[PDB]
Structure formats: structure tokens, C-alpha cells
Amino acid sequence: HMRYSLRQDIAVEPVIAGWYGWSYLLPPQTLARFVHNRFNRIVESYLDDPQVHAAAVRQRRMHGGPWIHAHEHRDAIEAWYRETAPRRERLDELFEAVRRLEEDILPRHHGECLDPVYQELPAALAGRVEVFYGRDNRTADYRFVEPLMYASEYYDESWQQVRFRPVTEDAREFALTTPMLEYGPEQLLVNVPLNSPLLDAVFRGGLTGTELDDLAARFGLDGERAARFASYFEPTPEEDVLEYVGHACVFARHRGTTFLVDPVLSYSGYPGGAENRFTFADLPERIDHLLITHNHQDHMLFETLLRIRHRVGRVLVPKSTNASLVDPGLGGILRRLGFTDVVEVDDLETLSCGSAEVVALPFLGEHGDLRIRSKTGWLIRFGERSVLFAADSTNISPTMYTKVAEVIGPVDTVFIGMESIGAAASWIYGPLYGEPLDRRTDQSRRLNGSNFPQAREIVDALEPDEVYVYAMGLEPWMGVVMAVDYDESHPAIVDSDLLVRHVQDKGGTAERLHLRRTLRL
Amino acid sequence: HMRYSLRQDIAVEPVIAGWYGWSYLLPPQTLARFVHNRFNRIVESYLDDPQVHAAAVRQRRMHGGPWIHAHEHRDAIEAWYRETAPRRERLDELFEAVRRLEEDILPRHHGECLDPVYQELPAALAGRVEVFYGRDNRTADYRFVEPLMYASEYYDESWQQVRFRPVTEDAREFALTTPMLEYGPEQLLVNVPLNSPLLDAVFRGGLTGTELDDLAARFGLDGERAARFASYFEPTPEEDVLEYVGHACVFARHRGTTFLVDPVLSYSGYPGGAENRFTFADLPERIDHLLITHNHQDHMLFETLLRIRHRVGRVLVPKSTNASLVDPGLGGILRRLGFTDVVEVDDLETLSCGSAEVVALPFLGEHGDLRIRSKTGWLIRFGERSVLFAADSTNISPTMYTKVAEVIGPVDTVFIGMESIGAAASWIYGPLYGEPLDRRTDQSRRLNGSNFPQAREIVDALEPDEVYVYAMGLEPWMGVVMAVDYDESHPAIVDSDLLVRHVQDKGGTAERLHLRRTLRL
Ligand SMILES: [Fe+3]
Ligand SMILES: [Fe+3]
Ligand SMILES: [Fe+3]
Ligand SMILES: [Fe+3]
Ligand SMILES: [K+]
Ligand SMILES: [K+]
């Protein structure tokens, strides 16, 4: 009996409360802030004049701004907006409760026992927060008891969906500001929790035709919708490597153990695409260790994560207990996505992984000076050979990498990002703030990685033989999550050219990676 | 050939920079605060008038205050104080650097990019801190990069010792405020890192006479000192349990797997002691899982921990990344003590342990409203039977245990502390503050556990059949670390009597435990 698997050219996009899914949309407290302060404003702006959004989207320099890219579908958006009104109002109860805690309850205390705060808590937060004083012993603060927030009614799995659609080209349009509706007859929007075993059945494949119908039924699909689901399937078709796959994503194998860092893959089975890409079909059966450096949209892509989930053994992430709006727990987020073996690792702790050893390295900067602990570089020692994936690590704190080198010893290879001009922090995180900063102050708070002198100092402290600049946002499929417009005048490109020369002139190898590349190890 | 092991009546007391060893003395940044703000003041006060300390120590109600109990040994103390002056001055460089960061550098910023802070850091802190803004986006704060602090010169293992001495009775004198010197010819003070494998050789024992001499030599001992060491040794002499051992310490075995929570043991081999105590000699060969609820002096006793270390498989502790002076990393502290398999667990995460499952439960309160995340209750499910060790958990946040019960399901047995009148927070933590609170405000900040209504609500939310009140500080050997003076008028005792009745009157079993007790499971 014939067996079928998901086509390689069909993307399954994640959806949370109508929007393309990413980390900060899963915890209810942070969803509530984004809905209230960002998403409702984008929709209401659109429904008051669709032509402004049309005019912005018509221009590539505006891509990544607060614009609905599906501007021709006013009625669908309007109906979607009115049907979900009770979900917005439930969530606004959590929004208001946090506001009340922050503005009306906590600032009334000045160093005395905080027991009376708990007796005054809004119902949405009762039993689900902890309060305490900061370092001055007088200014009250709080954090969330995160798993009780996920157990609350404000975390609602029925608001989660996926949208199936074909992929017809390498480039992807910016997706984070457009409601995720079934805009065309080729697309299918299905109600399903992002952690569902049903999604695993989909991605694992190997199903008979009748099994596919059982699966379609468990998804509540019938009729032409079930036939469309079926049409997304087609008859089903070990020594060392290090492979640069794209942006910050690198694949390795060592003595049979596999590793994938900051995962982002592209698709295949459509004509006209670039050649020699590392796509989903190139993945091995098992990904023993998945490593994530930090919680930025371009390093943890839900769409990629859900598709590879069924192959993954263990996930490694940086450790945080902040349990705040700017820094929700990454491990908790990954477990809500259905990853069941997640390990958090602190500064300079070591963990053995197959035949290799992984060490977490400090990662400072690139987070707009927010109190965010969820970031690290990963050093992997593959026997005698050690590789650092530094992602967007900076050298804003001079001497740290010298101090780190004194503990970790020598490193042979360094992948380092050089996105030296980054977005304003308020663009990514502003909806989470209690109130805005004044505008000129806000402008100084950016999400910058290493420029040339910063990278130079890191490489000099660590003394690798090979240095690759990566994580530059050049691959067209990264357009889902960032603006991908490139020229060799860009300060970032110039600064990477300097770094590459610097390293060449010291006797090492160096290169800014552009597209897939097989490598030493 | 005859073999020898450490006598049961010989205690090996930990010493850090001259003082009895406990958690907050190991990280250099917190040692520096305690030395500068507490210990130097106690010594200088003593050396100006020994008779005040004599007069305080003469009275039991004062025990636990800032008093040197070895008051008759003025010259030894004076010489010790003058010989260690260069260690105090090295440490004062770290003290001053932190002060400068907190008072002069950080308050100059008001929301703008913090990069220039790093360029101004004192040398002691360069490369070893991270700065960032709090929730208001304008008030700057910081934390330590903890392993770089341990790699710095301010963390100095040569300042660590142990002191061997006989134990001749159950009661122990309060030890935390008296320099740990060789006050008598029966005592031996040895320079050795607290994490040394040499200490493991000592505690494991089974050594021949000549092996003991090799060991004495590796400790740098010769002559009469080596003979005194030798005299501390004597010829060397599996179904389910739950055993209350003392204060908050409970031992369990389940399907062969062993568990020890909040370890504190007493000694034996001396006449006149209470009968039927669970002492070091009663330990099994292996302690598979060691669990610590929180980082208070009466729940993590270095003296007990070092002695059992060689038997321990894995340590479980609450998770924190605060990396602050009030909340240094517990896991980092345990690894510096030589424990090599330590796992940190967050709110409501589960871990399988032998045949049982452990779940961490939220623990709020009893920490003076400080930002301290290093605290949890432990739920162990031993097959069908589940036991909660709640330690000093409170119910200051109404509804939390109801919300927790909705996630964890039913619990059969609860051990709960009821130390409802606790010390002032500034007594334990005050040396770590940047400056004092005004005195009347400070008085409201206490380290209280559950009183009667608080315990009642917890038991009511969780519905156990057995409830034991524990962790009451009644055992005489807890005098090392707290004042042990008891009467049935004490509000704490009365409130526990009410709780015990309440539970009896609902059909369950209940008891305040006093001394060792074998139990159900
Ligand atoms: Fe980033
Ligand atoms: Fe990035
Ligand atoms: Fe306590
Ligand atoms: Fe206690
Ligand atoms: K829920
Ligand atoms: K050191």
C-alpha cells in the first residue's frame, strides 16, 4: 500500500491569535502587551485607511514596518477582527491587571513588608506573581510564576493555528505584521495547538491514503478542505561534517552525533531557486542536539522548529529566571512548543553531548540594555577541534573575552555575526514597555552586534585560525522576519571586509559566508 | 594490614577567611561585603573591649548576636587579625569597586545607551559584570558574571581551612561570629580547599596507617600535628523508608534509590547524648539524590555537606540567574564545594529520580522581600505516594496553592515548617545591602515562615492525609547556626498545636516532630 509524505514545497506557517507565530506571542502576559500595544493599532490603522498600508507596502524600504501586506482583503480582515473581539477582551483583562500592579499597587510601597500587595492583587494575577524589592530595598518589583500563567485561561491553545501554503520562490515576504488568514484557495488555515502530535504525524509522513484521511478528520477537516490537505502530500521518496546552512544556522556531525545551531532552513521542489541550498530534505533522521543562542526572531524561527521537531533529541538554551515581560523563560517557551528535553545552561558551564562537549559563553550586548539573560554563545569541542558560535555577541565589555580565554583555553574556529547597525530596541520590544521613553533617548537604544573593532578584539582574544562572518541576513528566505536589502556600501559589509583582512594578515583564514558552504570541522 | 576511618565523634568544621563557613562566604563579592560590613566590625569591637563580648556571651538570650564566643583568647585573635590584613585589603579592593559601580557610575544614566559604563569600570570588575536597565528603562542595574568572579584573584582557595575537633555533647554553641582558630590542643586547623579530594579521602576512610601518614603529608602536616591528625582515626568498624532526622532533614529510600533533603546530621561515640538519633554512621553507602529547598543557614550546612559529599550522586536545587549579592547562584556555590552533578529546577518542572519523580513547587516568602529566586518546595512522587517538603514555605500569596493543586493533583503527606517569628532580614542579609533602611522600616522586614492560618490554607489546598510540622530549630545541634531556646508559650509552638488539631479534626494524622522518627512513606 502506497505511502505519502508532506511535499518539500509546502510551508506550514505557525499562527498565534491571528499573527505569525514567534517567541513573545506564546506567554499570555507578553501576548497581551503585543496585542494591546502593537497588533490592535496596526489593524485599526488599516481599517481606517487601507491605502496608506497599500502605499507603504508598495515600497521595499518600508518592509518591516507596521504594515498589513495583504491590503487588498479588507473585508476578510474586518470580519476576522470582529469575530475575535471576545479573545481580545479576555486578554485585555490580563493587560489591565498588569498595568494595575505596576502603576497603582507597587509604587505605593517604600521599603516596608510587602505582604499587603498580595491581598490587593487583581484576580487575573492572584497566586501567579511574586513581588519583592530591588537592590535599593525601597522600589517594589515583581515577576511571573510562569507555569501558573500557562495554566491560566489567558493561555489558550485554541487560539493557535497553522497555515499550509505552497512556496514558489527563495525570497519570502515580511510576515510579522499581517493577519494570517486564508487569503487564497491554495492556502489552508487549520485550528491546532502548535505542540500537537498531529503536526508531528504530518511532518514525519509515511502515511497511507486512508491514514491521511484519518489525520485530516482529527484536524476537523472535511469536503474540499480535506482534499486540499491531501494535495499537500506526495508519494514518499555518517562521517564528520560542518556545514554553513544560512544566516546563523550551522549543521555539524561528529562521530555520528548531529548538531544544529540557530535553525533556519529553506524549501525545495519549485523551479527557479538558487542551487546547492541546505533545505529540509537534507536533514538527517536525527538531530541529537539543537542549540539556540538567543531569543531573537532570526535565531528562533517557529516555522523551522515545528517542522524539525520530530527529529530532535535535546534542545540547549541559555538559562534565565527573570520571568518578566522582556525576558520570558525560553525553556518554558520551547516546552510549550512540544520540545520535551530542554536543558538550560549558565555562563561557562559545560555539558557533554555525544562525543563532544558544549560550553556556554557569555554573550553581552545587542539587547538594547534590557534585563535579558536569555543569550549565550556556544563553544563545542569536537575532540581536539573547538568551534565557537557567537551569534550576535559583542565586545562592549572590554577584557571579558580575555578573561574567558583564560578559563576556556584556545578556540580554533569562530563564527561571528557583524550586524553592526541594528534596529531600535523599541521596534522589537517597545510593546512590552510600561510607557515610552522620550524619543531622542530611545533612539540611542539599539540592537547592534559587533562592528569591526569589536570583532577584532574578540578574535584577538580567542586566537582562532578560521573566522567566518555569518548571521548577516543576506539569504532571501530571512525576509519572513527581517528587511533583506543589500549593497556593498553598507557599513556592516565594509566592517566585515576589514575583519576578514585583519585575520588574513595574521595568517588565518577568514570569509563572510553568503550561501551554503561545506567546511573543515 | 589494619585500616582506619575518621572517628564518629570528631567534627570537621569548614572555615572561610577565618570564619565558620556558609554559602554567602564563598563568592568573593558577597565575602567582601560580609568582611567589610560585619566581620571587621565584630573583631574591632572585640579588640577594644573584650569584656562586653564576655558579658554578652555569658547570657543565653544574646547568643546569635555579633559576639566572639572565644573571648578569653585576645592575643591569638589579635595576631590572627593582623596576619590576615593583606587578605582584607585585597578583598577591600573588590568592596570598593562594587561601591563605585553602584553609587558613582550607574546612577549617572537615565535611559540612554549604557556602553560607556563598561569603559569606566574599576579594574576589579572589568569584564566581570553586565549592566542593564530595570523595568522603568531609566534606572541602571547590574549583575555578576559569576564564573569570572570565581576565576578572579578575589576568590582565593588558600584562604580556606578545616578545623578538626572532638564533639562531647549534643548541643552546639553558636559558631558564626567567632574566628575559627586552634583554641585548644585537642583541635587541629588545616589549610585546605573545601573542595579538596583530600577531604574525601578523610571522610571515606578505610586507610592503612602508612596511607594516613601520606595523607597527613599531603595536608602539610608533620610532627605532633601529624600525630594529632592520626589520633582522629579509629580501626575501621534495602527496602522502603521515610525517616525524619532533624530540623528540616528527611531521609527516604524507595525501590533501592536514596534521597536526603536539607541535610543536617549529628555525631556519635560520646556518652550522655540523646538516644536513637540518626547520625552520620546511619547513612547508607550512597545518597543518590540530595535536595536543598533554599539557601538559608539551617538548610544548607557546609559541615554536613562536606562530610557526606563522597556518598552523593546528584544534587537538586532551585534555579536562579539573579547573579546578585543577595542571590548568588546556588549551583555555582555547590560546584565550588566539589559537588560535580548539580541540577537546577524551575517552578513546577519535573525530573525523574530513580523510580520516583521530583517536582519543584513555588516557595514564596520568608526572605524579607528580597529579590531571591533560590528557594523551592520539593514534591516527590514515590509511585502512588507523594510527599511535599515545603521547608519554610508561606501562604502570603493567597490562591497560589489552589492554583498549584490544579496542576500537580493530590498530595498525601506534607512536611511544613512553622517558624512564624523569624529574624530581621537585616540580621542575615544586612551586610549585603548598599546602605541601611531607616530602623523602623527595617523592623517590618522579617524572615517569617507560616503561622497557623497560613499553614491551614496550604494543607486545605493540598489535602494531605499526614501533616508533620518540622524545621522548628528544636534539636540541640542546630545551635551552631541559630538560637535554640524553647518554651510552650512560644507563639510558634502554639500555632503548630492549632495546626495539628485542625488536621486531626478533619480526619487526618498530624504531629510536630521533635526528634528522630521512622515513618510511613
Ligand atoms: Fe540578535
Ligand atoms: Fe541576529
Ligand atoms: Fe528559611
Ligand atoms: Fe529554616
Ligand atoms: K491554559
Ligand atoms: K580564583
Give the key terms:
EC 1.14.99.65 (chains A, B), iron (chains A, B), Metallo-B-lactamas (chains A, B), 7-stranded mixed sheet, homodimer, binds potassium ion, 4-amino-L-phenylalanyl-[CmlP-peptidyl-carrier-protein] 3-hydroxylase (chains A, B), binds fe (iii) ion, 521 residues, 16 helices, oxidoreductase (chains A, B)
Could you characterize what this model shows?
2 copies of one chain form a homodimer. Chain A is of the alpha/beta class. Chain A has one domain. The first copy, chain A, has helices at residues 28-48, 50-57, 74-83, 85-105, 115-119, 146-151, 197-204, 209-218, 223-230, 302-308, 330-336, 400-408, 425-429, 439-443, 452-462, 491-504, and strands spanning 3-6, 10-16, 19-20, 129-133, 140-144, 160-166, 188-191, 207-208, 233-235, 241-246, 249-254, 257-261, 287-291, 312-318, 342-345, 350-353, 356-361, 377-382, 385-389, 413-417, 466-470, 509-512, 517-519. The two termini of chain A are 43 Å apart. Chains A and B meet through helix 5, strand 4, helix 6 and helix 12 of A and helix 5, strand 4, helix 6 and helix 12 of B. The complex binds fe (iii) ion (4 copies) and potassium ion (2 copies). One fe (iii) ion binds next to loops of chain B. It is classed as metal binding protein. The entry lists the keywords Diiron cluster, Beta-hydroxylase. It forms a dimeric assembly.
